[model samples]
Target: MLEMSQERPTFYRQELNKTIWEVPERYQNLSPVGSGAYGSVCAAFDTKTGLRVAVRKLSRPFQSIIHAKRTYRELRLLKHMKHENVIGLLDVFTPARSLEEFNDVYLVTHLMGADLNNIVKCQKLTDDHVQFLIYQILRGLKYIHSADIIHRDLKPSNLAVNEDCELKILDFGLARHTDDEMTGYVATRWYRAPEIMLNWMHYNQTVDIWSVGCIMAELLTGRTLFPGTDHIDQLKLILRLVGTPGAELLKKISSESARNYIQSLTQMPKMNFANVFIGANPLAVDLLEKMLVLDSDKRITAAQALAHAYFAQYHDPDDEPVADPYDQSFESRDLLIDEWKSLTYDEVISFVPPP
Candidate 1:
């Protein structure tokens, strides 16, 4: 590795997207993609691989302690990832020659054509489109959950879908071990699970299933299913659709305010999923019901959801695979700023281009 780094010391420093990126000279044809609060992303031709890739530049990742930890966890799991329905990490590098100068992190991955948000807003998706899209999501989720990882932030924007309906689940910023304690802000309000929404009980990977259900309904109706303006409204929106949680789920609420709130709400009858998704396939509706259940304990697992009748046509048990457990030693440990820098640089230097 040292020999490889010694030979590739030349880096082209360019200023764009509100930050400077010192990228390897091999990558060319850089073009703007999008910029967010934490990082900027652009597409470029990887002259080495002879393919297009997305280069994500994290602006001063180590400046914020939380951001550095987040980057490390994301990088560790991404480097261990391998699945057709999951985005692959192509390369990672930093321009800094010494650990002391390491402040930015450059992440490269497949340059997907578009995300689910882009497609949903602009085009009509048929039942086949929705079914295939969901199948792929569950396919990826099954692999993630197999390793005891729960993808906390499952949403339309996080999903990368192509014109051919190939869907890859990306953005593991909130993902953590299933054994991790419950944390608020797991996902956007609408896509969040009811258990997490109301703090009903300890959540599991089924939370991701709930998000998939929300995404499924969105695809069916071409609109957001639970558009909660606030946390209270969000719970109300969920209760209205899933119907009343009844006494059993109410007892599961650990928060006194949450319990009292549910108790005070007007009892409403459970609404049929098909009522909203009229003319939708019965199997699809049934699977959605199983997924959006008020009880996280009973909510269908990703593996179970894929086995439901809805995906009978697309089911291929032999084709589906689980992931090896990711090394989560870093999630629980605290590291100083320099320690994070050292580990990230090591991870970056380990990248070997395919010839």
Candidate 2:
């Protein structure tokens, strides 16, 4: 492990044949793609491979403890996770010449033309388009869930797709190992599951399924299904569609305050999917209905959703199975701040670009 110091030299190489750690020398014509709270992304032509790649430059990973953890989590997950539906981490580097000077973490990945949010909003998606898009999302979710890891953040922008209809899931910053206690809040408010929105800590992988349902409905209607203004209103929007939870489900809520808050709200009628989707196939509506349930336990699993009759035509049994186990076995944890920095350097040093 390399220690952080003002003068400690850090090694980096950019050529394709050898493992490289610097950015500008290997990639040219860098242009901004997008920017977010955590970092900014750029698209550039890979000089070595003659392919376009997306690079995410962390604004300041080590500036805050949270940012550092997220940087490490995304880097680690991308390195270990190998599947067609998940983003591939091609390379990572820092421009800093010394460990103490290290401040930015740049991740290079496969470039996609557009994200689902841009496609859903800008283009008029037909039934066939919606079907394939949702199928790919579920496929990615299935891979993520199979490892017992829950993608805590699932929304259209996080799902990248190409002109050829290939979809891949990215952004593992908020993903959590299921074996750990669940967080009270995760995912965007509009796409968040009811259990998570209400501050329940004992939820499961189905939380991601709820987000998938939100995205599926958004694609079909060409509008956000639950555009809640806040967490309270988010619940209002969700209840308005799925109606109120029954006694059995309400009892399952661990927080007394959350349970009481919901119990007090006026009961609402469940919206008919047929009317919402308007001329949508009965099977598609049925699948949507199964996914949008208020009870997390009743929501459709990614595997089960794939097996549904609605996706029978698109489902392929020959898809390669994701082999990595979803556990803490691969995680780098229980370390001090500098120790984490040392671990990150080793991980970066170990990266070998795919030929």
Candidate 3:
């Protein structure tokens, strides 16, 4: 066993050596679990117990001021996170002082289950399954945003599910401490909120809710809520489905410039998916209509959404939910990790391909 002194600093500050059993010499040789534009992620084992771990190695730790701040903010916010639906951090570090020697940033975490995108791609889903998935995501978003953290990027691709079908929020690379200075040009084009597309700076967690709405719609239909070629096409899709922004929604707009831009945009009628999908359930359509509104404020949040009939309709009133995924024991964790380690990083990385 490694003896770590209380006085010892993080692995980043300490000079790594074989003597340090907990923190290895370096991520010199590890099997790649995943890789992306940011960097590669690997699966490594502890020398002592061979316990498998997932480590996300960020390429440019000091890429820019905002990126650095985001890195630090992710750690900070994660410290406060403890939920069944939110992925937990196991450990983290920045490589030693030399940037050249330290080409990566490490975020050690519990391996995620199947991503929503992959599941949807391979399996067919019913209305109940879609509702359950969206509800869990909303629950996580509400808790995180309530803690004052904004997940600037929220989409099905970021949601993971264990074999038991419990959903967990996986990535936090684009999450922010707050909604101020919304400058991160992050998020999938299909899942992006309108304000982000228009480059609105002063936004809020409502952006995440918008994405949840879009994802929920897609889950039910098994197709994109707004399939668009560009931002303008997205806007048109949203307008046609949700109806054009009314004067009431515009009156509350925080940015004068944003409001003006929205006003100048042409209005289109609501896009009815009912016509698109034959015999689609009316209840699910009703829920989607309420969520994918033109105005951000009008969007359904996790807390508000929890009370909505969408969840209530499908929930089993007689039985309580299973224990939260967080409180599981070491045996459970080990099994989860084992299942995760079985999957090669290449499979996962290629599965999404990070766009």
Expressed as tens digits, the lDDT of each residue in 1-355 for candidate 1 is: 3363345556898787556778888888788888876579888999877889999887667775676776777777778778989887888888777777777788888899889988977878877888999999999999999988778778888899887789899875353333333344333667888776556676677788889999998898887887776777778888888887777777777888877777788989888887878988888888888888987777888888788888888999999999987777788888887787678888877766443
Each model's TM-score, in the order given? 0.88, 0.83, 0.70
Which portions of model 3 show Cα errors greater than 4 Å?
1-29, 46-51, 93-105, 173-187, 254-266, 269-278, 313-355
Candidate 1 at 327: error in angstroms?
A: 2.1
> What lDDT score is found at residue 160 in candidate 1?
91
- Residue 330 deviation, candidate 1, in Å? 2.0
State which candidate has the highest lDDT: 1
In candidate 1, which residue pairs clash? none
lDDT string for model 2 (289-337, tens) is: 9999988888888888888999888988678365477555535556566
Counting only residues 3 or more apart in sequence or on different chains, how many pairs clash (N, Cα, C under 3 Å) in candidate 1? Answer: 0
Cα lDDT for residue 207, candidate 2? 90
For 1-355, candidate 3 gives per-residue lDDT tens digits of: 8645423233423222211222344333455665565556666664433446666666554455555544444544444566667776555554344333433446666657479888887779866777788778877776677666667778777889766668988664354323523333233777877776676545577788788878876776677877777677777776776777877877776789877877787777666767755566776666666677767777766676776776886444333222222221222232232233222121222221011
Best-matching candidate per TM-score = 1
Using TM-score as the measure, what is the rank order of every candidate, best first?
1, 2, 3
lDDT of each: 0.80, 0.75, 0.60
Worst 10 residues of 2 by lDDT: 12-21
| Residue-level lDDT for 121 in candidate 3 | 73
Any idea what lDDT model 2 has? 0.75
Q: Distance from true position, residue 102, model 1, in Å?
A: 2.5
